[PDB]
Amino acid sequence: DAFRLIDTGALINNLEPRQTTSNTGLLNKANIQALIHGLNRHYYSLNIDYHKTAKETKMLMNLHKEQWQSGLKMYDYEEKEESNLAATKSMVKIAEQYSKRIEEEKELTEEELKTRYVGRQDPKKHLSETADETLENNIVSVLTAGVNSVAIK
Amino acid sequence: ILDKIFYGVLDQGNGWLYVYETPNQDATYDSALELVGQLNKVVDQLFEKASVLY
Amino acid sequence: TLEPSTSITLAERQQLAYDLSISALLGDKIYNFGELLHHPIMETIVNDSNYDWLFQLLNALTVGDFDKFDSLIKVQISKIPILAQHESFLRQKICLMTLIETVFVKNIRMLSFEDISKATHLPKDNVEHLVMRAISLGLLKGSIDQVNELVTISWVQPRIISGDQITKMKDRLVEWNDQVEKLGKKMEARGQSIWV
Amino acid sequence: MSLQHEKVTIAPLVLLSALDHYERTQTKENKRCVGVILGDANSSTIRVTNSFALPFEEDEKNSDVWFLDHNYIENMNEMCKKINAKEKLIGWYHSGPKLRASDLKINELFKKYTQNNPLLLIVDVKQQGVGLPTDAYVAIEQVKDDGTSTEKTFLHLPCTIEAEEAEEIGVEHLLRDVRDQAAGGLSIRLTNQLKSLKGLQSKLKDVVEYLDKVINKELPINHTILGKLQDVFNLLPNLGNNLQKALTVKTNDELMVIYISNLVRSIIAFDDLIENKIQNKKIQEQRVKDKQ
Amino acid sequence: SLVKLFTTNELMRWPIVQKTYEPVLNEDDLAFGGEANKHHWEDLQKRVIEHNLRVISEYYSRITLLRLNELLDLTESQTETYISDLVNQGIIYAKVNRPAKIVNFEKPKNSSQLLNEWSHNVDELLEHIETIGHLITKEEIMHGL
């Protein structure tokens, strides 16, 4: 946010240089702590409008463009099995915790469930997160394997 | 062989003692089966919870 | 790294080319003479007949001729005792030349003891040591099999590519690129609902 | 001599300064624009961080009529050192569109100012490209591919655009209208896969075109390129047998894992539906018995 | 020359070594230098046989027993004893087939190894195609001038 000093004795007129001929300046709201140091007392605030250009915004996109030779690169086919086995074991444990959760939920009152899973692993969002993450990783692995097996040959 | 010390198979052809590497029994399927059992139990508990809805 | 300011004596450079040919023939980690033959260094004796015998022998080496090689080596074994000392090494070079050229012509990732024996003139019992030398020197990366003579071949030492080979490689490129384009078109058409 | 040319990292500020430079000096067609690429080096990954304008001049004539001010480099060096002593000259960049004749010649002028081998950075300032518009070219001496005198020429390096904390904030703010911040994980990975496939197709078409040119002898015969192509063919695996069976068994296992995960997702949805129905029934009862 | 013999991946004949380098080795002290050094010659024979096996297993895959005895020069049963000892220590992967008189020096490849090799080959192919693409433009500039 830019600033520019108040004039001087225009406070005698009390008309700090601000003619509200448009709403475009009044939309911005002065900060709280900024007024503590004095905002409308010594330097009327200004507006800030970053103006872009088609060339610049087109091509700053390149910061999130991966290398072309990385999409078809399958990673080592041992980690993709250890990860699956670990995810399956975690799924088994989380399902057991889900069973005990459902068992315990029968005799709990809402004033506790509103704060029950604050400090302990909620064994439902973990299950959904593990399922979604492993399914996404697995689908990507399948598609990469098949695509390279067909196109590369 | 019956005690599974070496995973060979004895034969009565002429006195041969074929020796085979240990089997694999991949852990993924065992984990999947325990998961399936746990999800079965979860299904029964969830339907029991749905009795109040009915 | 030679410079055009001076090319010293033509006779001395001819002798240098002669020595280079001798060393290439008697060098261990050299198994393709194409670089020397089509280099300007060979222009010094590209016409002279005094050292034409070794040029013919080098051409036979590259082609793989046996009887012509035998006659030439018999006649010129007395030209220098240095070549006479390493005649067995030269014969092993002939055998390796024949093996490499037969692998590159007949293709086939597998082979047989009988084919190598016929194409290298060695008995079917010495082919094994021949491939031992070939693998150790880095020409191939295969693996032997003696119970059934089925020598297996993998990546082979590269060779300078001629004009004809370009057309076949270009056509294979065209086919591969067309396959890739078809796969990409199918992939784009099938999943246009999520490509954002 | 340092071998530091393995990886190149560019902050977006250098590149945007390049674009600003090109749009500022009103460079028309065929007029290249050149500046310096201040950054940090002596590590394996050369990193470009800041740039500035240079008074480079050249007539579209004999390649040796190129002109460049010598005092300007040191004069900028002193001020930039005063601002920050951690940014040292590591070469130069030109405003594309592709390598020119004088690139090898002018690079030697920056040899004394630079400490390591000067770095060339091609910038596709007018944006004809599709991939990254930046590539590095370190001048090194290696034997000729035609069996002739060793030549000191340029070598391409893998350049990746990466930002630091200071510049990532600005980049994320500036393009905070076109980037799809929702996107989704699997969808963005699949889009990356398709983009990589299209890039492979484009490079294959370029190689095919170059071979078509070389068979007509518009270009000479390079045995290194042909050898690399033959190696590419040799490395091409044959699938359509033992590898086929291994791939099939892995795919089957992987699909079974996918099946398990989908089952888990379905049961989670089941619990969500049950809980939501319970809460809806409770809300209906609440409204009914409080209205009455 | 002796160092060259025990560094090159090439099988050597035991009698050739035992009759070629034997005089120079014998005229010495400490090692191979008298009756008390007879303890060393057996060790040298064992080492050369071990080197022969380490080369053959690196090259061969289905060596038959008769030719294996020919190469190692071990009589008939010392060959099987040696193979047994070296595999028991864990240097080489070997498996005998006495009724068929075959030796399977190759190690069967698990699916993980196969797919890792395929992935590495595909990665090398992609890297090489990138290098070709980036050299094509350089040479086009060089000879388009």
Short mmCIF file of C-alpha atoms in Angstrom, two decimals, chain E residues 10-138:
data_model
loop_
_atom_site.label_atom_id
_atom_site.label_comp_id
_atom_site.label_asym_id
_atom_site.label_seq_id
_atom_site.Cartn_x
_atom_site.Cartn_y
_atom_site.Cartn_z
CA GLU E 10 40.09 -64.68 -18.74
CA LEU E 11 40.46 -68.30 -17.67
CA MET E 12 44.02 -69.54 -17.17
CA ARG E 13 45.46 -73.03 -17.32
CA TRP E 14 46.84 -74.24 -13.99
CA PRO E 15 49.79 -76.20 -15.50
CA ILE E 16 50.78 -73.18 -17.62
CA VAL E 17 51.08 -71.03 -14.49
CA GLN E 18 52.67 -73.87 -12.49
CA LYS E 19 55.39 -74.26 -15.15
CA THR E 20 55.83 -70.65 -16.34
CA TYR E 21 55.96 -68.45 -13.22
CA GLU E 22 57.09 -71.31 -10.98
CA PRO E 23 60.89 -70.74 -11.29
CA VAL E 24 60.76 -67.00 -10.53
CA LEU E 25 58.39 -67.61 -7.61
CA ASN E 26 60.52 -70.47 -6.28
CA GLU E 27 63.78 -68.47 -6.17
CA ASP E 28 62.63 -66.33 -3.26
CA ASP E 29 62.18 -66.26 0.51
CA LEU E 30 59.11 -65.70 2.69
CA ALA E 31 56.61 -66.98 0.10
CA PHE E 32 57.15 -69.91 -2.29
CA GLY E 33 60.73 -70.10 -1.05
CA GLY E 34 61.45 -73.56 0.31
CA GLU E 35 59.98 -76.67 1.88
CA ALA E 36 58.24 -74.67 4.62
CA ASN E 37 56.62 -72.66 1.80
CA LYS E 38 54.89 -75.73 0.35
CA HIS E 39 51.92 -74.40 2.33
CA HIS E 40 51.72 -71.55 -0.21
CA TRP E 41 51.56 -73.47 -3.51
CA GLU E 42 48.32 -75.23 -2.55
CA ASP E 43 46.89 -71.81 -1.68
CA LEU E 44 47.93 -70.48 -5.09
CA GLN E 45 46.23 -73.43 -6.81
CA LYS E 46 43.06 -72.82 -4.80
CA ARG E 47 43.15 -69.11 -5.66
CA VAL E 48 43.58 -69.75 -9.38
CA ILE E 49 40.71 -72.26 -9.36
CA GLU E 50 38.54 -69.73 -7.52
CA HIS E 51 39.40 -67.09 -10.12
CA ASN E 52 38.53 -69.53 -12.91
CA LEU E 53 35.13 -70.18 -11.33
CA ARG E 54 34.54 -66.46 -10.73
CA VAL E 55 35.16 -65.85 -14.44
CA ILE E 56 33.13 -68.81 -15.73
CA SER E 57 30.10 -67.94 -13.58
CA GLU E 58 30.32 -64.37 -14.88
CA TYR E 59 30.31 -65.63 -18.49
CA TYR E 60 28.73 -69.09 -18.65
CA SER E 61 25.18 -70.13 -17.80
CA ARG E 62 24.81 -73.91 -18.45
CA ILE E 63 28.33 -75.33 -18.26
CA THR E 64 28.41 -79.12 -18.43
CA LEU E 65 30.33 -81.04 -15.78
CA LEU E 66 32.90 -82.59 -18.14
CA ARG E 67 33.91 -79.28 -19.71
CA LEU E 68 33.86 -77.67 -16.26
CA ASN E 69 36.39 -80.27 -15.11
CA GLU E 70 38.39 -79.59 -18.29
CA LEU E 71 38.57 -75.84 -17.61
CA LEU E 72 39.26 -76.03 -13.87
CA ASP E 73 41.50 -79.11 -14.37
CA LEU E 74 40.15 -80.56 -11.12
CA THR E 75 39.98 -84.32 -11.46
CA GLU E 76 36.34 -85.36 -11.10
CA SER E 77 35.07 -84.84 -7.55
CA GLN E 78 37.32 -82.02 -6.39
CA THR E 79 35.29 -79.91 -8.84
CA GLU E 80 31.99 -80.62 -7.07
CA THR E 81 33.67 -80.21 -3.67
CA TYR E 82 35.06 -76.81 -4.67
CA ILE E 83 31.74 -75.65 -6.13
CA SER E 84 30.06 -76.75 -2.91
CA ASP E 85 32.51 -74.87 -0.69
CA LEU E 86 32.45 -71.62 -2.68
CA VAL E 87 28.66 -71.56 -2.85
CA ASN E 88 28.42 -72.43 0.86
CA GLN E 89 30.62 -69.46 1.75
CA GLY E 90 28.41 -67.38 -0.54
CA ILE E 91 30.58 -66.04 -3.36
CA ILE E 92 28.84 -67.59 -6.38
CA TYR E 93 25.30 -68.72 -7.22
CA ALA E 94 25.62 -72.27 -8.58
CA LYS E 95 23.31 -75.28 -8.74
CA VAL E 96 24.38 -78.75 -9.84
CA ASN E 97 22.23 -81.25 -11.77
CA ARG E 98 24.35 -84.41 -11.30
CA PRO E 99 21.99 -86.86 -13.11
CA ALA E 100 21.91 -84.44 -16.05
CA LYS E 101 25.52 -83.34 -15.38
CA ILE E 102 24.60 -79.66 -15.75
CA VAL E 103 25.48 -76.53 -13.78
CA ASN E 104 23.08 -73.56 -13.79
CA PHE E 105 25.38 -70.64 -13.04
CA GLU E 106 22.64 -68.10 -13.82
CA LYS E 107 20.57 -66.62 -11.02
CA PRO E 108 16.81 -66.74 -11.74
CA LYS E 109 15.45 -63.21 -11.95
CA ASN E 110 12.50 -62.16 -9.82
CA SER E 111 9.84 -59.94 -11.38
CA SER E 112 11.16 -56.94 -9.43
CA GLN E 113 14.55 -57.21 -11.15
CA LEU E 114 12.91 -57.57 -14.57
CA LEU E 115 10.71 -54.50 -14.16
CA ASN E 116 13.53 -52.44 -12.64
CA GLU E 117 15.72 -53.27 -15.63
CA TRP E 118 12.88 -52.38 -18.01
CA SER E 119 12.34 -49.06 -16.22
CA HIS E 120 16.06 -48.26 -16.33
CA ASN E 121 16.15 -49.06 -20.05
CA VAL E 122 13.17 -46.76 -20.69
CA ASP E 123 14.83 -44.00 -18.65
CA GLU E 124 18.06 -44.34 -20.63
CA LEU E 125 16.04 -44.24 -23.85
CA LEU E 126 14.31 -41.02 -22.80
CA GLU E 127 17.61 -39.43 -21.76
CA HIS E 128 19.21 -40.41 -25.08
CA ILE E 129 16.30 -39.02 -27.09
CA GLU E 130 16.59 -35.74 -25.16
CA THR E 131 20.32 -35.59 -25.90
CA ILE E 132 19.67 -36.29 -29.59
CA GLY E 133 17.06 -33.54 -29.71
CA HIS E 134 19.46 -31.08 -28.09
CA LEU E 135 22.37 -32.02 -30.37
CA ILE E 136 20.31 -31.79 -33.57
CA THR E 137 19.73 -28.07 -33.05
CA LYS E 138 23.39 -27.43 -32.20
#
